[PDB]
Design a protein around this ligand. Structure first.
Ligand SMILES: Nc1nc2c(ncn2[C@@H]2O[C@H](COP(=O)(O)OP(=O)(O)NP(=O)(O)O)[C@@H](O)[C@H]2O)c(=O)[nH]1
Ligand SMILES: [Mg+2]
Lengths: 170, 205
């Protein structure tokens, strides 16, 4: 059907949970088996937003540096970005300003960006307070969520907020 | 220990195991088996051989998904890791049958598998090589042989063919060959010695 077809990219460092995030949103499941994405992949999900069907093609990128070129070759045509870090990994959070610069350099399209701190179920191993993440989100102009691909917390809410921002820019 | 000799052994063993299924045709039904079936048989035998020799720590086989095989023009990736746990080589392998599908994207992907493989290897970097593996030829349908992408490109600067026809042209005219052990002998120390292989094909048997 699809009057609307939106291109979304999930980007961020390796091991923050990007593939797990996409699989939880698309198939409602989680496996602990870490396999690192080689290059880029995508999935298509259709949603009933406020009135009518919207088809999202969501591109999971690879976080490793050697694929940084090829993933940036797929930033064109993007209307939305999930910039994702890990709340148990400070190196992932220190990189998000570089990732936001990468979005502004290689993509812009005036595309909406949302900042997600994944693995919020791992509170015993938390290293980044939520206040730091929401302060940097206020600074960069992005919406902020703390999510868990493992426990399905704030996962579909983040995609819904990104799609709502994309629709509100029309 | 030695990664290169085991990967060449595994390629030879997988080709010998795949030889049984090449050239099968049943005229009262579907003639040919699917390309994905031959790819999966080759990969299963290769991966089991590599697991038996304990080389999984320095060798990673990634079978591309249907989307990834469409986008990259490659059927699988072989990643060669070093002692320092960094990636030293990546072979992007596309398979062809010479005896004789986007499905989700919204087209701009009009390119052939050759051009997509070349663009993939350009984007990854200089340590990512492209490799065509041919299962069967016109005449002798059970022959398996490899061709490096750069040798094809060196022939396209002369012949002016599109790369898909240029590979098929290269395979049926080249008499000179290099064994897979000799090709993979370098494999870690120098990168360009893989791509300066020249006007030869790769012999697997
Ligand atoms: N506890 C917990 N673990 C998670 C969560 N999301 C992912 N993980 C774990 O973190 C690891 C990495 O997940 P993965 O999705 O592969 O991350 P990635 O960003 O796709 N890695 P890459 O960019 O290299 O492809 C896996 O072991 C996975 O089980 C989460 O919400 N909670
Ligand atoms: Mg991944």
């Amino acid at each position: 059907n699809f009057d609307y077809m939106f291109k979304l990219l999930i980007i961020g460092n390796s091991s923050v949970g990007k593939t797990s995030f996409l699989f939880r949103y698309a198939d409602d499941t989680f496996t602990p088996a870490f396999v690192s994405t080689v290059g880029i992949d995508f999935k298509v999900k259709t949603v009933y937003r406020h009135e009518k069907r919207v088809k999202l093609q969501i591109w999971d990128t690879a976080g490793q540096e050697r694929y940084r070129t090829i993933t940036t070759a797929y930033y064109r045509g993007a209307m939305g970005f999930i910039l994702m870090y890990d709340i148990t990994n400070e190196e992932s959070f220190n990189a998000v300003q570089d990732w936001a610069t990468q979005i502004k350099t290689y993509s812009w399209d005036n595309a909406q960006v949302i900042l997600v701190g994944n693995k919020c179920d791992m509170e015993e191993e938390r290293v980044v307070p939520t206040e730091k993440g929401q302060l940097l989100a206020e600074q960069l102009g992005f919406d902020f969520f703390e999510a868990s691909a493992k426990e399905n917390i704030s996962v579909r809410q983040a995609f819904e907020r990104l799609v709502d921002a994309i629709c509100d820019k029309m | 220990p030695v990664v290169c000799e085991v990967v060449s052994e595994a390629i030879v063993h997988a080709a010998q195991k795949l030889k049984e299924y090449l050239g099968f045709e049943y005229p009262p039904s579907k003639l040919c088996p699917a390309a994905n079936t031959l790819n999966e048989i080759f990969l299963i035998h290769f991966i089991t051989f590599c697991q038996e020799k304990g080389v999984d720590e320095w060798l990673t086989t990634t079978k591309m998904t249907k989307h990834q095989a469409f986008l990259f023009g490659a059927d699988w990736i072989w990643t060669f890791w070093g002692s320092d746990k960094q990636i030293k080589l990546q072979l992007a392998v596309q398979t062809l049958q010479m005896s004789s599908p986007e499905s989700r994207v919204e087209s701009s992907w009009k390119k052939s598998r050759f051009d997509k493989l070349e663009e993939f290897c350009n984007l990854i970097g200089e340590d990512c090589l492209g490799l065509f593996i041919i299962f069967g030829m016109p005449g002798k349908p059970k022959d398996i042989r490899g061709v490096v992408l750069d040798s094809v490109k060196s022939q396209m600067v002369r012949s002016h063919l599109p790369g898909g026809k240029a590979v098929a042209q290269f395979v049926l005219e080249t008499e000179d060959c290099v064994f897979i052990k000799e090709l993979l002998r370098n494999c870690l120390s120098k990168k360009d010695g893989l791509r300066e292989v020249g006007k030869v094909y790769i012999s697997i048997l």
